[PDB]
Amino acid sequence: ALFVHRDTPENNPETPFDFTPENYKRIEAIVKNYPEGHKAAAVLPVLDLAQRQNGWLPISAMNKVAEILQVPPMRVYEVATFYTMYNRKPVGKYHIQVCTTTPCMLRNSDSILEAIQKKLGIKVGETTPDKLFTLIEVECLGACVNAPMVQINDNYYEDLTPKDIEEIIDELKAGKIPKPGPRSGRFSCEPAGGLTSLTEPPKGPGFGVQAGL
Amino acid sequence: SGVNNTKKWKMEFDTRERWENPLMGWASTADPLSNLVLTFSTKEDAVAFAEKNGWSYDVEERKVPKPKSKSYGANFSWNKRTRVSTK
Amino acid sequence: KTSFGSLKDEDRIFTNLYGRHDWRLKGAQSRGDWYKTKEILLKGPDWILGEVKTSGLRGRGGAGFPTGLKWSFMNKPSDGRPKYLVVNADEGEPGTCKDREIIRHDPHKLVEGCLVGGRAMGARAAYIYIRGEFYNEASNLQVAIREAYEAGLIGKNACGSGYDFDVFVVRGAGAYICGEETALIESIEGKQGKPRLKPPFPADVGVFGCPTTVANVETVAVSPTICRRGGAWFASFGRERNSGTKLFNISGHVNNPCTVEEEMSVPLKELIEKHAGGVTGGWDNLLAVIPGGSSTPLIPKSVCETVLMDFDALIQAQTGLGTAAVIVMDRSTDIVKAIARLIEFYKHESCGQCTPCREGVDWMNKVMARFVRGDARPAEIDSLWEISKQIEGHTICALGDGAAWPVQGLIRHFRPELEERMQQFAQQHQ
Ligand SMILES: Cc1cc2nc3c(=O)[nH]c(=O)nc-3n(C[C@H](O)[C@H](O)[C@H](O)COP(=O)(O)O)c2cc1C
Ligand code: SF4
Ligand code: FES
């Protein structure tokens, strides 16, 4: 939880890191989205790419991003510590992120967080000894109408009950990758028990278009 | 950063010997004017006071910070080196 | 009109809101997207800004500025720098998930909106900034953008109009403050998401120090339709100065939490009951509502009986429309704790740049945590009110205001609850 770095045998400037040749190709595409002379705009996506390859960001990975884009390391350090999606210490294979802001809290996100801890045997902020799961609370994830919900890696699992999230975790242990989305019966954000709108077939091209076009 | 101590003109005299008191180590002096500092509204008043009292003096012209050109927007220049890399 | 609501499907813009039709280009084209886009582009920026102005459209990101006037700031002769449209898809306000559905279910509405909107401003490219947690939505958008490029709808000679336009998706890395328009720009430039002071204004000095307009996803995504069906058609919905339709998120204590599109100025009670299935336990079980996302002050049940969901009506109720994120709390809710959790949210999201929010929001969080337990004295309530007024209006960005308003709403409408909790704690610890 600290915002100062101390060298350790497993995280120091001589920790091995380097982009793969395939990932170097992606960096060029990233760097070409921004005007020439403003390459520093690529720090966030390139730093995120380093995390996608390595799972997290050692100080060596940050130094490499600074080196490639030719920005001071401090400016990369500032970015890595500002945004909460960058992992500056190793996390588990499955980073379980439970939303606990008020809209999800109102719909009993507490029972979800409790169920995960009881099943995994860990506490919030901890990693399992087998290093398969890391559990943390997070702020609103932009899926409030589908609360309570969690994000595991890149996927949202929504409309959860303690039963739903235990099956999801059991699938992850089994190696199966569960499908994201609501587990209650609806497919997305539509009201449960049937659409109250958008039930009629949609109008086609040119419907209601004003005169002059 | 306060500038309220740079308004008036001051007259002070040349520094003279201070030595250690053998007993305590305190700083002793034989200069009666060692602490005498006078305040004036203008250098002309200061010079007039110095002249009638027979003191030879040096006048140092007032240093004023020059007006600066400040622009918060230059921090984000499209093509100039004034673009800051952090906030 | 006197009564607003009961919007008909023909008049809905986001006709694939629930993803039950194809979201890719073929589906979007069959639903009326990308239609006569070339004709709209050849009418020129002044004509487009005319339709947006006539429509009475106002920013859907929360602040609600009149869009037509705001977008016209860019309609000025070029000075040499490129001009950019930045589309705000950060979507960070708790209770707000409306922009998420547009990006993944109606991505081609957003892409066309960027092109049409970007044309009005004379922009060369649009940067769509999407929050990093919306990974699958960003990929859906990226697929949709490839289709438009492959069809010649964007890029060189966009739609055959002779206008060159690019659409870039840049992802965030987890920060609610990066939804603030200038902090968004700072993030695109690769710095910490810290807002800039104004002036300069983005239309003069913006992303990469170039003229820029930041526009919300919903605001941009409706511009193609307004230009096709006319500003007069859009302006025919809602009250005067509160025109159009609006996406509503209803969450909290309702039977059927959902995202729905409804006319502006729809009564709040009708919205919760017609679409969200009503308040859990019945309308009489209602305690309070947060009408426009966590930043807007809460209103109690009595105010909710007749309040309309538009900009002007909710300002009369001492709150705001905000993002139209309706968070419902019933009588079983611990209101003090609910608001306390929101202050804890703002404490975690403050960028830390400026003193009143870096120090004050953290200060408000510690006081609220004691108010939850009643571990306080009544004199501290007016202290907390005064602290909030020292933050509001004194910060660089509106996050400080957004942290102080929820506190004021609690004190304004639930002061007796705060005092009962303090009175009860003293007894148990006397
Ligand atoms: C803390 C904070 C977070 C914000 N988050 C968003 C957001 O997620 N999406 C958005 O459109 N506007 C957000 N805004 C408002 C923007 O700063 C800006 O008003 C808006 O993008 C303007 O676009 P519009 O006129 O179309 O609404 C936020 C503002 C603040 C102060
Ligand atoms: S109000 Fe808060 S979030 Fe906004 S600039 Fe100041 S410290 Fe940063
Ligand atoms: S409050 Fe949890 S997704 Fe918004």
Which whole-number Å values give the CA distances from C17 to C5, C97, C108, C248, C259, in the listed order?
Answer: 18, 12, 12, 11, 8
In angstroms, the CA A168 to CA A174 distance is 10
CA of A54 to the centre of ligand 2 (A): 32
How far is C-alpha C36 from the chain's CA centre? 29
Which amino acid, C212? Answer: T
3-state DSSP assignment of residue C251: strand
What ligand 3 atom has the least distance to the C-alpha of C95?
4
Indicate yes or no: CB of C345 within 8 angstroms of CB of A35: no
Identify the H or E element spanning C190: none
In angstroms, the CA C391 to CA C51 distance is 39
Chain B, 46 to 85: residues with Cβ < 8 Å from chain C are: 72-73, 75-79, 83, 85
Would you state the structure tokens that stand for residue B83, as one six-digit string? Answer: 């673009």
Token pair 């998401």 is found at: C193
CB-based contact A97:A85 (threshold 8 Å) = no
Sign of the CA dihedral C53, C59, C60, C63? negative
Write the CB contacts of C318 (distance below 8 Å, at least 6 apart in sequence).
C297, C299, C409, C412
In angstroms, the CA C289 to CA C201 distance is 34
In angstroms, the CA C421 to CA C424 distance is 5
Indicate yes or no: CB of C191 within 8 angstroms of CB of A202: no
Write the CB contacts of A130 (distance below 8 Å, at least 6 apart in sequence).
none
Angle at the Cα of A121 from the Cα atoms of A120 and A124, rounded to 5 degrees? 85
In angstroms, the CA A67 to CA A75 distance is 11
Residues in chain A: 213
CA of C92 to the centre of ligand 2 (A): 15
Q: Kindly report the number of other CB atoms within 10 A of residue A196's CB atom.
A: 16
Angle at the Cα of B28 from the Cα atoms of B27 and B32, rounded to 5 degrees? 125
In angstroms, the CA A59 to CA A91 distance is 15
How far is C-alpha C268 from the chain's CA centre? 18
Q: Is A103 in the pocket of ligand 3 (CB under 6 A)?
A: yes
Which amino acid, A61? Answer: A
Angle at the Cα of A76 from the Cα atoms of C357 and A138, rounded to 5 degrees? 50
- Beta strand A155-158 with A181-182 is parallel
Residues in chain B: 87
What ligand 3 atom has the least distance to the C-alpha of A101?
1
In angstroms, the CA B14 to CA B29 distance is 13
What residues form DSSP beta bridges with C125?
Answer: C84, C166
DSSP chain A: --SS---BTTBSTTS-----HHHHHHHHHHHTTS-TT-GGGGHHHHHHHHHHHHSS--HHHHHHHHHHHT--HHHHHHHHHHSTTS-SS---SEEEEEE-SHHHHHTTHHHHHHHHHHHH---TT-B-TTSSEEEEEES--S-GGG-S-EEETTEEEES--HHHHHHHHHHHHHT--PPPEESSS-SSSSPTTS-SSS-SPPP-TTTTPPTT-
Q: Is A99 in the pocket of ligand 3 (CB under 6 A)?
A: yes
Write the CB contacts of C412 (distance below 8 Å, at least 6 apart in sequence).
C297, C318
Which amino acid, C222? Answer: V
| Cis peptide leading into residue C200 (ω within 30°) | yes
Question: Helix crossing, C107-120 with C135-150: angle to 10°?
Answer: 60
DSSP B66-84: PP----GGGGG-SSSTT--
Closest CA to C298 of C273, C261, C263, C325: C325
In angstroms, the CA A158 to CA A160 distance is 5
Would you state the structure tokens that stand for residue C284, as one six-digit string? Answer: 């009489």
In terms of Cβ atoms closer than 10 Å to its own Cβ (0-12, 13-18, 19+), residue A160 is buried
- SS in 3 state form for A121-139? CCCCCCECCCCCEEEEEEC
In angstroms, the CA C296 to CA C315 distance is 10
CB-based contact C232:A211 (threshold 8 Å) = no
Q: Whose CA is nearest to atom 6 of ligand 1?
A: C179
Identify the H or E element spanning C214: strand C212-216
Which residues sit with their C-beta closer than 6 Å to ligand 1?
Answer: C 59-63, 65, 88, 90-93, 176-177, 179-181, 214-216, 219, 397-399, 402
Question: Helix crossing, A73-82 with A43-54: angle to 10°?
Answer: 70
In angstroms, the CA A157 to CA A144 distance is 12
Which amino acid, A145? Answer: V
Neighbours, chain C (3 or more CB pairs < 8 A): A, B
Q: Kindly report the number of other CB atoms within 10 A of residue A43's CB atom.
A: 25
- Beta strand A150-152 with A133-138 is unpaired
Q: Kindly report the number of other CB atoms within 10 A of residue B28's CB atom.
A: 13
Which whole-number Å values give the CA distances from A81 to A86, C191, C195, C335, in the listed order?
Answer: 8, 11, 17, 33
What residues form DSSP beta bridges with A151?
Answer: A97, A156
Which residues on chain B are in Cβ contact (under 8 Å) with C194? 87
In angstroms, the CA C62 to CA C218 distance is 11
Q: How much is the CA Rg of chain B, to the nearest whole Å?
A: 23
In terms of Cβ atoms closer than 10 Å to its own Cβ (0-12, 13-18, 19+), residue A7 is exposed
- Technique employed here was cryo-EM
Q: Kindly report the number of other CB atoms within 10 A of residue B70's CB atom.
A: 6
How far is C-alpha B10 from the chain's CA centre? 9
In angstroms, the CA C112 to CA C217 distance is 12
Would you state the structure tokens that stand for residue C249, as one six-digit string? Answer: 């998120």
In angstroms, the CA C149 to CA C155 distance is 6
What 8-state DSSP symbol labels residue B62?
P
Would you state the structure tokens that stand for residue B75, as one six-digit string? Answer: 């921090």
Closest CA to A29 of C82, C168, C191, C208: C168
What residues form DSSP beta bridges with A115?
Answer: none
In angstroms, the CA C40 to CA C116 distance is 8
In angstroms, the CA A94 to CA A127 distance is 10
Beta strands in C273-323 (DSSP E): 286-290, 299-300, 308-309
Identify the H or E element spanning C30: helix C25-30
Residues in chain C: 430
Would you state the structure tokens that stand for residue C225, as one six-digit string? Answer: 């339709």
Closest CA to C7 of C260, C192, C220: C260
Identify the H or E element spanning B21: none
3-state DSSP assignment of residue C193: coil
Which residues on chain C are in Cβ contact (under 8 Å) with B86? 191-192
Which whole-number Å values give the CA distances from C413 to C38, C299, C304, in the listed order?
Answer: 53, 7, 13
3-state DSSP assignment of residue C326: strand
Indicate yes or no: CB of C204 within 8 angstroms of CB of B73: yes
Which whole-number Å values give the CA distances from C288 to C214, C295, C301, C311, C329, in the listed order?
Answer: 33, 15, 5, 19, 5
DSSP C229-248: H-HHHHHTSSSTTS-SEEEE
What residues form DSSP beta bridges with C325?
Answer: C249
Token pair 């490639």 is found at: A68
The dihedral over CA atoms of C141, C142, C145, C149, expressed in degrees to the nearest 10, equals -170
Closest CA to C345 of C293, C397, C276, C408: C293
CA of C185 to the centre of ligand 2 (A): 15
Query: C211: domain CATH number?
Result: 3.40.50.11540
Identify the H or E element spanning C39: helix C37-42
In angstroms, the CA C380 to CA C309 distance is 33
The dihedral over CA atoms of C218, C219, C220, C224, expressed in degrees to the nearest 10, equals 100
What ligand 3 atom has the least distance to the C-alpha of A100?
2
3-state DSSP assignment of residue C169: strand
Structural domain span for residue C183: 25-236
Q: C305-339 burial, b for 16+ CB within 10 Å, e for fewer?
A: eebbbbbebbeebbbbbbbbbbbbbbbebebbbbb
| Cis peptide leading into residue C66 (ω within 30°) | no
CB-based contact C330:C253 (threshold 8 Å) = yes
Would you state the structure tokens that stand for residue A6, as one six-digit string? Answer: 């101390």
Which whole-number Å values give the CA distances from C299 to C62, C286, C387, in the listed order?
Answer: 18, 11, 21
Would you state the structure tokens that stand for residue C197, as one six-digit string? Answer: 């002071």
CA of A98 to the centre of ligand 2 (A): 25
CB-based contact A97:A124 (threshold 8 Å) = no
Phi and psi angles of residue C363, each rounded to the nearest 5 degrees, phi first: -65, -45
What residues form DSSP beta bridges with C308?
Answer: C267
Q: A163-192 burial, b for 16+ CB within 10 Å, e for fewer?
A: ebbbebbeebeeeeebebbbbeebebbbbe
Q: Which residues of C touch B (CB under 8 A)?
A: 81, 186, 191-192, 194, 196-197, 199-200, 204-205, 208-210, 353
Closest CA to C213 of C187, C238, C185, C232: C185
Would you state the structure tokens that stand for residue C417, as one six-digit string? Answer: 């609850």
In angstroms, the CA A202 to CA A189 distance is 19
In angstroms, the CA A127 to CA C216 distance is 38
3-state DSSP assignment of residue C163: coil
Would you state the structure tokens that stand for residue C29, as one six-digit string? Answer: 């084209």
Would you state the structure tokens that stand for residue C80, as one six-digit string? Answer: 């040499």
In angstroms, the CA A69 to CA A76 distance is 10
In terms of Cβ atoms closer than 10 Å to its own Cβ (0-12, 13-18, 19+), residue C153 is buried
HSE (side-chain half, CA atoms, 13 Å) at A19: 20
CB-based contact C319:C297 (threshold 8 Å) = yes
Resolution value (Å, 1 decimal): 2.4
CB-based contact C54:C230 (threshold 8 Å) = yes
In angstroms, the CA C168 to CA C118 distance is 13
Which amino acid, C206? Answer: G
Nearest ligand to the C-alpha atom of residue A149: 3
Please give the interface size between A and C, counted as residue pairs whose CB atoms are below 8 Å apart.
238
The conformational region for residue C319 under phi > 0 = left, psi -120 to 50 = alpha, else beta, is beta
Nearest ligand to the C-alpha atom of residue A101: 3
Token pair 């000095």 is found at: C205
Beta strands in C253-349 (DSSP E): 258-263, 266-267, 286-290, 299-300, 308-309, 325-330
Helix (H) and strand (E) counts in chain C: 18, 11
Would you state the structure tokens that stand for residue C87, as one six-digit string? Answer: 């589309």
